[PDB]
Amino acid sequence: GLKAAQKTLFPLRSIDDVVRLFAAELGREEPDLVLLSLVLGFVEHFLAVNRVGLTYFPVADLSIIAALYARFTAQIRGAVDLSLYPREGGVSSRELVKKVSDVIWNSLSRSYFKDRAHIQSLFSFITGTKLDSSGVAFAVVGACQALGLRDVHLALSEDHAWVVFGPNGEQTAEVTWHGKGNEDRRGQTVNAGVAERSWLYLKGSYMRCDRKMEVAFMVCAINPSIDLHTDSLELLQLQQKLLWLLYDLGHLERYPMALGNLADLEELEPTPGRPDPLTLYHKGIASAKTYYRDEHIYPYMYLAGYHCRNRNVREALQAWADTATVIQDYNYCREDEEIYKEFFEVANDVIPNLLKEAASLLEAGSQGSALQDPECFAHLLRFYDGICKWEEGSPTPVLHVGWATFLVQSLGRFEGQVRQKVRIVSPVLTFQSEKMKGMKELLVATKINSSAIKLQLTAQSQVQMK
Numbered sequence: 316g317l318k319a320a321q322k323t324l325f326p327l328r329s330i331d332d333v334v335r336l337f338a339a340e341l342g343r344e345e346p347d348l349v350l351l352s353l354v355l356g357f358v359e360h361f362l363a364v365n366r367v368g369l370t371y372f373p374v375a376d377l378s379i380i381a382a383l384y385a386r387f388t389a390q391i392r393g394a395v396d397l398s399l400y401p402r403e404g405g406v407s408s409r410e411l412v413k414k415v416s417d418v419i420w421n422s423l424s425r426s427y428f429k430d431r432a433h434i435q436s437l438f439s440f441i442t443g444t445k446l447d448s449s450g451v452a453f454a455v456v457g458a459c460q461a462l463g464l465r466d467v468h469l470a471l472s473e474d475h476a477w478v479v480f481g482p483n484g485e486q487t488a489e490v491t492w493h494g495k496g497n498e499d500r501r502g503q504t505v506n507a508g509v510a511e512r513s514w515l516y517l518k519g520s521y522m523r524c525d526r527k528m529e530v531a532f533m534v535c536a537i538n539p540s541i542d543l544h545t546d547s548l549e550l551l552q553l554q555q556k557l558l559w560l561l562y563d564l565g566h567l568e569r570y571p572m573a574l575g576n577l578a579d580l581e582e583l584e585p586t587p588g589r590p591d592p593l594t595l596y597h598k599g600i601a602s603a604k605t606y607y608r609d610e611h612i613y614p615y616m617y618l619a620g621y622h623c624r625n626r627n628v629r630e631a632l633q634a635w636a637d638t639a640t641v642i643q644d645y646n647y648c649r650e651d652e653e654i655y656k657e658f659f660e661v662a663n664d665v666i667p668n669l670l671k672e673a674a675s676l677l678e679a680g681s682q683g684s685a686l687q688d689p690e691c692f693a694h695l696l697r698f699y700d701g702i703c704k705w706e707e708g709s710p711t712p713v714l715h716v717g718w719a720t721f722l723v724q725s726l727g728r729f730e731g732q733v734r735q736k737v738r739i740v741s742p743v744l745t746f747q748s749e750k751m752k753g754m755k756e757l758l759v760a761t762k763i764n765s766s767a768i769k770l771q772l773t774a775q776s777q778v779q780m781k
């Protein structure tokens with residue numbers, strides 16, 4: 316509206332007053348995305364961007380919030396004439412969605428850093444004329460809600476956002492950019508990307524938000540970072556409380572990554588009486604398995620990161636093997652570079668560092684070491700198997716010799732007598748990739764044949780002439 320009933324909690328004088336507003340809005344027929352994003356962006360601005368003057372909490376006065384709300388609704392209602400786009404069926408048209416996307420896009424500053432923090436909310440859009448990529452999608456959905464377009468909803472993958480709309484909510488439209496130096500496809504469907512089985516479009520097993528999930532998205536999108544070294548405790552607490560509110564109401568059920576976010580927050584500062592981080596990471600995975608065909612990577616990455624921080628080598632390795640077992644059934648496509656980066660960093664930085672420490676601890680007499688556990692070696696092998704299987708049939712390769720040195724080093728961290736105990740069947744392990752099947756022969760020698768491994772991993776044909 317803003318409607319009278321939306322205004323009665325103001326002024327918001329604390330974290331808990333913000334929580335009450337969210338609870339009130341989530342109890343309404345449709346939570347007001349615009350209101351909520353403006354409030355979050357306001358409080359984030361004054362807790363993370365500019366803390367000058369801060370004594371407890373930046374009080375959000377109704378006059379201030381209502382004026383920001385008015386700037387937004389005036390900008391959208393002025394620029395989008397609904398009469399030009401008649402709605403057949405209580406549903407929106409592709410032209411209307413494109414128009415709203417154009418209105419948001421055309422309002423943005425000409426030149427700015429798109430990867431900066433704190434440009435996710437409608438507060439940033441109004442006061443800074445700046446949004447990040449998924450921020451533009453969210454703003455399109457808020458604008459559509461403000462316009463009364465109840466069928467337009469946010470669609471999310473693990474690295475991209477777009478909208479669904481139309482008859483049965485079955486249409487897709489691009490409304491923002493993706494990445495850097497990719498040509499935009501605004502207005503188009505996502506069908507080509509689904510059909511090519513890229514990770515970016517999750518084989519169609521992406522999130523189709525309802526309004527409550529769009530609230531969950533804006534909560535996940537809070538950025539407590541003040542700088543590289545420092546987070547706002549106030550925003551961490553707000554985000555954590557809002558995620559628990561959403562959890563209790565059922566609205567994280569279909570949102571794996573929100574569960575991982577919440578688990579990470581609980582690891583940092585546990586809430587008494589709540590599930591442990593591990594329970595929450597596993598609920599995230601269960602959500603992915605239940606609702607999304609187990610085709611998501613981050614629920615497993617979140618779990619592995621927790622085990623890695625807690626130096627639980629065995630369970631970290633298991634979780635990264637599970638990440639690989641998901642990726643193996645995708646094709647590595649242009650625009651998938653963010654997941655390539657995750658796998659690269661895990662293989663070539665995180666695992667090596669973990670195993671280096673484990674090696675030092677073994678030298679010092681640790682018992683029950685992952686490096687003496689053939690099941691742990693099997694997890695390492697399954698991780699590489701999935702990466703190799705991912706590469707099969709992909710339009711672009713994954714592996715190169717830059718990965719090979721780290722593989723040799725990681726294999727070598729396990730003594731031959733440990734490696735010998737894994738049974739590779741056509742611990743027991745089965746390989747899906749042809750690369751790993753050919754490598755089987757090399758995996759039990761006391762001293763690993765490094766050159767032969769390299770040749771098998773990169774499928775390098777030849778060795779040096781001279």
Ligand SMILES: N#Cc1cc2cc(CN3CCC(Nc4ncnc5sc(CC(F)(F)F)cc45)CC3)ccc2n1C[C@H](O)CO
Binds near residue numbers: 449473476532616
């Ligand atoms: N092991 C491990 C590991 C855990 C881990 C955890 C993260 C944390 N990251 C996980 C993904 C999260 N992303 C999200 N969280 C909630 N909702 C959404 S909707 C969306 C799509 C888009 F942005 F809207 F377009 C993304 C996204 C943001 C936080 C990143 C890399 C991680 N890794 C890999 C590690 O950094 C390798 O160095």
